[PDB]
Amino acid sequence: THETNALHFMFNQFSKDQKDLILQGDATTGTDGNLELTRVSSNGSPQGSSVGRALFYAPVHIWESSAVVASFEATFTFLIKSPDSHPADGIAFFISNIDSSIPSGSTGRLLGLFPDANADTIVAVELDTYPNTDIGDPSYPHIGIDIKSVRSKKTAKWNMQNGKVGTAHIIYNSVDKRLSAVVSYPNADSATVSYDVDLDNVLPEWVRVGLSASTGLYKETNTILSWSFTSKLKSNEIPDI
């Protein structure tokens, strides 16, 4: 039908002066047509104590006073390399208040999203490369759903492939009120995580969507090779079933 508001963007390539991206922290574009979320040295080696994010310029309308909530899909391809086989801390796809910025000291385990481990409102999927078991991480690389806290509401084990290009697929289904992620490498296993959450209880009506990454003492390239996003809001739709 014809009763739907929608936003779609796709980057298969990033250049210098990517005017439709807001870059925060150490994030740069247009090195080999990639988005580097964390600082990489002149020789290609990642740096510690780094944090960076890229947000799409247009705000996204995610719910309305009718309790009608947008459905959305995000897809990105990433390259995490750690030459020392000591990677940290990971990549996140997030949804935030529109004027959200990098919280003070959100390097390392806090992934550029949270100021502490329990100002800004965050819903994220984490690709978490480093287990911090003292803040509820399982004791392995994992994907997680983060609702207003780095202490994931749900996690699944993630067999991350040092130096391989992987794909993350984020799905919000507003019929089911379910946030899900699938992370995969070619000719390898997929990891998946789901969590039931109505975003009209959690986020503002208007948000920005972004990618965030951090390093700490340990470090990794947090390289994004492509990023696509689609959001659909049908204002005259039944808000729940």
Cα dihedral sign, 142-147-153-154: negative
Q: How far is the CB of 228 from a second copy (least distance, A)?
A: 8
Site for a second copy in 2-61 (CB under 8 A): 2-13, 15, 19-20, 33, 56-61
- For residue 144, the partner it binds in Zn ion, Ca ion, Mn ion, none, with Cβ less than 5 to 8 A by kind, is Mn ion
Site track 125-154 with Ca ion (rule: CB under 5 A), x = hit: ---x-x-x----x-----------------
With beta carbons less than 8 A apart as the criterion, state whether 74 and 167 touch: no
In SS3 terms, 70-137 reads as CEEEEEEEEECCCCCCCCCCEEEEEEECCCCCCCCCCCHHHCCCCCCCCCCCEEEEEEECCCCHHHCC
**40: which DSSP letter?**
B
- Is 3 annotated in a binding site? The answer is no
Q: How far apart are CA 205 and CA 106, in angstroms?
A: 25
Out of 190, 198, 202, 218, point to the residue binding Zn ion (CB under 5 A).
Answer: 198
Site track 66-105 with Zn ion (rule: CB under 5 A), x = hit: -x--------------------------------------
H helices of the chain, where?
none
Site track 122-141 with Mn ion (rule: CB under 5 A), x = hit: ------x--------x----
Site for a second copy in 163-222 (CB under 8 A): 167, 171, 173-176, 178, 180, 182, 184, 186, 190, 192, 194, 206
Q: How far apart are CA 126 and CA 177, in angstroms?
A: 19
SS3 200: helix
> Is the previous residue joined to 20 through a cis bond, with omega within 30 degrees of 0?
no
Q: How far apart are CA 86 and CA 226, in angstroms?
A: 25
- For residue 198, the partner it binds in Zn ion, Ca ion, a second copy, none, with Cβ less than 5 to 8 A by kind, is Zn ion
Interaction site with a second copy (CB under 8 A): 1-13, 15, 19-20, 33, 56-61, 64, 71, 73, 75, 98, 167, 171, 173-176, 178, 180, 182, 184, 186, 190, 192, 194, 206, 226, 228, 232, 234-241
